[PDB]
Design a protein around this ligand. Structure first.
Ligand SMILES: O=c1ccn([C@@H]2O[C@H](COP(=O)(O)OP(=O)(O)O[C@H]3O[C@H](CO)[C@@H](O)[C@H](O)[C@H]3O)[C@@H](O)[C@H]2O)c(=O)[nH]1
Length: 436
């Protein structure tokens, strides 16, 4: 009997539900805790689709008294209500896996339950190394003053520059600066850490974390990746216009563009993207999240006259788009869920990091030889990226055939990490043994 507790946002619900499907295939009774009311509507649609596809999982509604960063506080300010709810649950609990962003309030709840508790870090193992090494960094008070490189011993990336550090982690009086300083030292009071990654993309960082090389006192970190897309996420769209447009395209020519689940780009930066998409000469599938006269007349004309581009304002099926053979490139913000998905389908990535851990995730892909990202573009809002750079970068990636070779073997390593040897297969087997 395992209990799951995802955080707000599709970036945390998607890997948690994919973790549930893999646990259910290992014959388990999984209890999915849902902090309701949920934030986004896509979270509501994925839950009911997953709960209907697996009616055997237990849904424990975590009701909170009266916006992704809004219920952030309401969960930890009311986390003392899950103690009567989780303890009044039979079959008796055997393990607990919650989100890393909830490691601060859920640790006293998990220790007072008597079960081996874990966290599920929804990002890369290299970023988890930066999260673990962060206490050791700030202790040397020459920070952020004289900090040029963050050299964590044995991680996949060489040396994390100051440019790749999340900006709020350097300024005083910052929330994530204080969140990292209290959540990271709590990692020692855990039984382990599950990360959506495999050896084919993060071999060194996984061996550095398990070898006690980042920081001392770390529990065993498990690479239960990749979290391959499942069928409960598939929406039966009555139109299905996107998949049928990709069918009439030569395989490997469409450039999929998506910046995640929020897309906080301004109206200025959105104009140059579409301006660079048509200036690259390649066909594109641009997914935009408004949360409207942004595109230009001659830009919309060239997208229709040349007959190459699709622009959608909807929650698309990214699994089918990346899995479609017509897609040969991926312009991504390097969110780790989209990275592991692109690694599963063997689609090379043009990294465009925006905030947070996306510059580190972009270097993990670039180190593997199946991704390219320009360091000069900086974070979102630092400066305007012209469409000439966008078209030039897209042409540099789609013409680079060696990226497809490395992305193909990463797909092979991903297909081998869940079947024959399977780091995901073994680690999940090694987790069922401690959950006796
Ligand atoms: O139209 C869309 C948009 C998104 N997705 C899916 O939604 C998820 C998005 O995950 P990800 O690519 O990681 O994006 P975010 O949700 O923005 O990721 C957040 O969470 C990640 C994990 O913590 C962090 O690495 C990122 O920086 C942070 O932005 C994936 O399953 C996508 O395939 C779709 O299916 N369709």
């Amino acid at each position: 009997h395992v209990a799951l507790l995802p955080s707000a946002g599709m970036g945390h619900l998607t890997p948690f539900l994919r973790l549930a499907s893999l646990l259910l295939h290992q014959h388990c009774h999984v209890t999915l805790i849902t902090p309701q009311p949920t934030v986004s509507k896509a979270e509501e649609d994925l839950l009911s689709r997953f709960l209907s596809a697996f009616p055997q999982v237990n849904q424990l509604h975590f009701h909170l008294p009266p916006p992704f960063f809004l219920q952030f506080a309401s969960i930890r300010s009311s986390s003392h209500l899950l103690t009567p709810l989780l303890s009044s649950l039979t079959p008796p609990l055997s393990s607990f896996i919650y989100d890393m962003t909830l490691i601060s309030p859920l640790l006293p709840i998990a220790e007072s339950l008597g079960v081996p508790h874990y966290i599920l870090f929804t990002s890369s193992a290299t970023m988890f190394s930066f999260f673990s090494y962060f206490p050791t960094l700030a202790k040397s008070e020459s920070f952020p003053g004289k900090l040029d490189f963050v050299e964590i011993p044995g991680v996949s990336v060489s040396s994390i520059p100051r440019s790749s550090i999340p900006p709020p982690l350097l300024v005083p009086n910052s929330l994530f600066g204080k969140l990292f300083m209290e959540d990271s030292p709590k990692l020692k009071k855990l039984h382990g850490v599950l990360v959506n990654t495999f050896e084919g993309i993060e071999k060194l960082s996984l061996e550095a974390l398990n070898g006690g090389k980042v920081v001392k006192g770390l529990p065993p970190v498990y690479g239960v990746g990749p979290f391959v897309p499942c069928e409960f996420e598939k929406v039966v769209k009555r139109g299905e216009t996107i998949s049928e447009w990709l069918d009439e395209q030569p395989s490997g020519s469409v450039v999929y563009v998506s910046f995640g689940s929020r897309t906080a780009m301004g109206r200025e930066q959105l104009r140059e993207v579409g301006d660079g998409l048509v200036k690259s000469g390649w066909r594109f599938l641009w997914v935009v999240k408004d949360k409207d006269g942004v595109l230009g007349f001659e830009l919309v004309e060239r997208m229709v006259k040349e007959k190459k581009g699709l622009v959608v304002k909807e929650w698309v099926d990214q699994s089918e788009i990346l899995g479609h053979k017509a897609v040969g490139g991926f312009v991504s913000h390097c969110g780790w869920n989209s990275v592991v998905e692109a690694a599963w389908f063997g689609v090379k990535i043009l990294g465009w990091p925006l905030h947070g851990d996306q510059k580190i995730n972009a270097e993990v892909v670039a180190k593997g030889g199946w991704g390219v990202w320009k360091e000069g573009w900086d974070w979102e809002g630092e400066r305007l990226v012209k469409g000439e750079e966008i078209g030039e970068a897209i042409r540099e990636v789609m013409n680079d055939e060696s990226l497809v070779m490395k992305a193909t073997q990463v797909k092979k390593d991903a297909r081998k990490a869940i079947s024959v040897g399977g780091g995901c297969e073994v680690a999940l087997q090694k987790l069922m043994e401690v959950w006796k």
